[model samples]
Target: MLKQVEIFTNGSCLGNPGPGGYGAILRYRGREKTFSAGYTRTTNNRMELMAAIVALEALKEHCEVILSTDSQYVRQGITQWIHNWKKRGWKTADKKPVKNVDLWQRLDAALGQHQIKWEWVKGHAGHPENERCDELARAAAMNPTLEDTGYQVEV
Candidate 1:
């Protein structure tokens, strides 16, 4: 049977391109798994993408996923923009290269393994999972940051 999983994801950065972190909560069959990690230097968007990527990648098999995030960037990018980006060799509408291609590619690969419902939630508005995810992200960002080599790769 395909496992049904619910994922709540959030990302944070102290400064635009400074220390960053991402958090994800995955629930399945009454069990929950949470992940959080910090990066020495990264953007919020990068951390956002990483959160989704990490959550999806942790699945060991195909699943029915309900993915919730406060990031329109993540929701819309996967549900809409990815089609064009893939068609155009990963370039944007105006032929400009897509930012964070590495993370985007990783997220795309992870998503291919499941059937997913992309959900957008208002962040920091007392939504339990979202709020917990935000807190996890912020807490992780407060820790000593680690290197994110993928974020350093030149586009």
Candidate 2:
């Protein structure tokens, strides 16, 4: 197992509740793992978090993972503020349960079982791979025929 790994993820939603998709890229041991999926009805946040979840899931388990994304909702929720919410029963500081508690909990649980690091990256900011993710995500959002673009291991 490599001591370090890098992952890039992005999500896009056309109309918040319209066509939405997630793209993830995992690089480790000189191999790349990619995943993308679209939903008929969903939010950008869901797709964003789902991208990271799918990337982590692609890991065989017990691997040191450095997850990066352009989503504050995903990165900040897990790394910075989720603990506080969990302590309060998944509620915000105002005692309101976070909107995406289920997905966040699942993502948190997946992250909890491994040595993982979450990082926030600027989206659509000229990063090559991050731009690839954005391209994939937006294409998925606009074209339903391309919905079959699912998880794949880079050969």
Best by lDDT: 1
TM-score of 1: 0.89
Error of 1 at 1 (Å): 13
Q: How many backbone clashes does candidate 2 have?
A: 0
TM-score of every candidate: 0.89, 0.81
**Cα lDDT tens digits for candidate 1, 23-74:** 8999866678899999888888888898898898888889899988998788
Clashing pairs in 2: none
* Candidate 1 wrongly placed segments (more than 4 Å): 1-3, 93-96, 124-126, 152-154
**How accurate locally is residue 35 in candidate 2, as Cα lDDT from 0 to 100?**
78
**Alpha carbon lDDT of each predicted model:** 0.84, 0.75
Candidate 1 has which clashing residue pairs, if any? none
- TM-score of model 2 vs. true structure: 0.81
